[PDB]
Amino acid sequence: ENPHFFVTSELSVSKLLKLRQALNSSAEGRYKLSVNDFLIKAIAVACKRVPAVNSSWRDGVIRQFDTVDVSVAVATPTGLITPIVKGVEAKGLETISATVKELAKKARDGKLKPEDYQGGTISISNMGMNPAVERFTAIINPPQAAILAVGTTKKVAVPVENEDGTTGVEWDDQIVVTASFDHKVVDGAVGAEWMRELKKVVENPLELLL
Amino acid sequence: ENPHFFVTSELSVSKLLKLRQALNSSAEGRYKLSVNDFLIKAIAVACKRVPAVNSSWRDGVIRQFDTVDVSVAVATPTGLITPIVKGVEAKGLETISATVKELAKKARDGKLKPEDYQGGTISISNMGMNPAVERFTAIINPPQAAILAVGTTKKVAVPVENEDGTTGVEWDDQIVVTASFDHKVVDGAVGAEWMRELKKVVENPLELLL
Amino acid sequence: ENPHFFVTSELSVSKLLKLRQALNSSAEGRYKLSVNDFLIKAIAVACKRVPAVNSSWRDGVIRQFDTVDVSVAVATPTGLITPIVKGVEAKGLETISATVKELAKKARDGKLKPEDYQGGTISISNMGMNPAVERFTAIINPPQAAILAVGTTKKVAVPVENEDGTTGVEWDDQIVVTASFDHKVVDGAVGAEWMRELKKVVENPLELLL
Amino acid sequence: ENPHFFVTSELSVSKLLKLRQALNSSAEGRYKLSVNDFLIKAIAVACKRVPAVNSSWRDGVIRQFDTVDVSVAVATPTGLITPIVKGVEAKGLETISATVKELAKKARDGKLKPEDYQGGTISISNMGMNPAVERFTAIINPPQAAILAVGTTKKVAVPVENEDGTTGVEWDDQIVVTASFDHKVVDGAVGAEWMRELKKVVENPLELLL
């Protein structure tokens, strides 16, 4: 029913990894941030910058949402459930990480209420904990217009300019992301622009601070 | 009427200055962050951690506020006005800087509405643009329980341990801050704790990211 | 009601720290002296040398006291209480330290009798255990005429004359103290003289032995 | 009754000390200038540049004064008296020093007439002769709008750029000054501007010549 199209990007996470390390060292056990928390915040910023992706199909209309409620895919013994982080734009990374850990526990325990997993405006699915999944596509969760699939981290050789003008080799830690879009709502231009903003914010994570 | 007491701290801003420089260079003219925007955000975080400072005196009761609406003192040709940044906890630094510049312009133009300057929960007054004001006290703006006065930046000699075990001299850029508190509401212990959290967050500005 | 004025001094504690270390090492667990015990004794000596500070306002008269009963501010979960060390001039440092620890425990336990905290002739408040409080003012505890606020210890670069006639840098451990005085009773001259005697005795702690 | 607020500045006196030395050496006993005479003249110049500080509260009106009559606080065995140097703008430093010494003697002798100490437009209190008073606040002498408290001189390490681009240490002789202002008459902006002019004139004492 949905004309799926896929847009893929490689993202450098070296700076994000350094930032995560510094923050987790400074947390004194109050929280433990994952890469997923940073990706969720960057998604929320990008959705605020390109609201057309923050929308849903309805009969005859596109419902654009003013809030970004991110449904996070959690595998359970009974399979996939999508608890919802509401109002992500207004939450700090600590609150996001804590909420996600709590909700994922409730998910595994089967104690989620319908309001915990009914609704949401965009989904994220992160399987990067499995080293055999470098890239995958995810099926859109209707009625959302977009889903971001996030693969595992791998080291990739990248060219570095040496001071002598030779090109050396640096090893960049990259993840592959693939956005699946519903072509009724989001065309290729909007999706590519949103992917550009996501890349920009993730590779310069100080923009996550604005 | 108010038993004023004062608590003073020296704050290292070297790291904050570096961060401000990097962000302003990356802004591409979209925004121009000042030190004041960082201090406002750090204040909002500290007020969220110690809500007893985020309160107001009323006849017979302390009204504690769930939101931190920061009144920012702006000098005008007609003197002092206090436009209010509402909901600071949920705003990014870009939105804060833009809002403050807009409101300060409206203030100078005399086009502020009463709702722009009536209310607020805590005040900040920043005179650090004048190099002859290293330290000052500010008079509390009733009914708020606290006001932070922020002086100018000066270089101070600080001891540094050299690799040889000698103590060298480093030059730390420090500001002096002075909080004035209403002793009916906030005692010395709460004020000192809040000053500790402010210092901690400003000197480790990555905590401003949480 | 009280015309508060403030007099501030930086005090070298390097010698006091060395003396405290030697005494605590020699105590064999009988006692454990804090800097606060030394400051209390020095206060008692200074109050004996300048009795005009050792006085209280009454309707029409200044009641000068022959004894120095020092009220020590202790933070409790219910806030501030002021247990009284009576007859400080006649007590040794061991007795002072033991009494203060016992009374502070009773304070936290809420087991102080009125006679333990009603009265006193001068107060001390010591917040130097918080590294974010370099300087503060304390509100006078009526009817006492004076209160000494004691901030935290910091290292300060001080000039030292080298044997070659060059000026090197030494690192002096300094505390900031601020006396608040009631200008009805104590004028600036008496307060400055008393601050001079306090500085003299603290920086030459052998005078605490006389 | 008076909303007191305090503005503090560190002032370099190295150049003023050199100038005082040269002048006193050239006086051949005709006069003996103190630092206080220079501060009085600089105050008079600053008051002429910012007359709003040179004013007094009256019921319903601010009386701005065209002349600067500086009341100088003198400690006596009976305490504080404020003899008045009239028309300071038109007097040279020699006349100021001579008048101050004469009036201070009459003060100690109790031979001041009411006209010698009734009135005045601004006060100065100088306790810098006591090395234990680095900083203090003074209570405003009504109906004057401002009082300047002047602490003692201390040596402070300041950064100096060496010819090799290293940062050495220089020892600057600094005094701390604290102006107390009545917030009904003088707001923070005017007080900070006046403090700026005072600093400018004291640090570049050739401007005292204009």
Swiss-Prot record, chains A, B, C, D:
Q: Where does CoA bind?
A: R20, S34, N36, R108, S125, N126
Location in the cell reads: Mitochondrion
Site, as annotated: May form a delocalized pi-electron network with Arg-384 of 2 other E2 subunits within the complex, which greatly improves protein stability: R135
- UniProt remark on domains: The peripheral subunit binding domain (PBSD), serves as a selective binding site for other domains of the E1 and E3 subunits.
Per the entry, what this protein does is:
The 10-megadalton pyruvate dehydrogenase complex contains multiple copies of three enzymatic components: pyruvate dehydrogenase (E1), dihydrolipoamide acetyltransferase (E2) and lipoamide dehydrogenase (E3) and catalyzes the overall oxidative decarboxylation of pyruvate to form acetyl-CoA and CO(2). Within the complex, pyruvate and thiamine pyrophosphate (TPP or vitamin B1) are bound by pyruvate dehydrogenase E1 subunits alpha and beta and pyruvate is decarboxylated leading to the 2-carbon hydrohyethyl bound to TPP.
Please report which protein family the annotation says this sequence is part of. Belongs to the 2-oxoacid dehydrogenase family.
Subunit and partners: Eukaryotic pyruvate dehydrogenase (PDH) complexes are organized as a core consisting of the oligomeric dihydrolipoamide acetyl-transferase (E2), around which are arranged multiple copies of pyruvate dehydrogenase (E1), dihydrolipoamide dehydrogenase (E3) and protein X (E3BP) bound by non-covalent bonds. The Chaetomium thermophilum PDH complex contains 60 E2 units, 12 E3BP units, about 20 E1 units, and 12 or more E3 units. The units are organized in 1 E2 60-mer, 4 E3BP trimers, about 20 E1 tetramers, and a maximum of 12 E3 dimers.
Q: What is this protein called?
A: Dihydrolipoyllysine-residue acetyltransferase component of pyruvate dehydrogenase complex, mitochondrial
- Can you name the source organism? Chaetomium thermophilum (strain DSM 1495 / CBS 144.50 / IMI 039719)
Complete protein: which residues are present?
Answer: 250 to 459 of 459
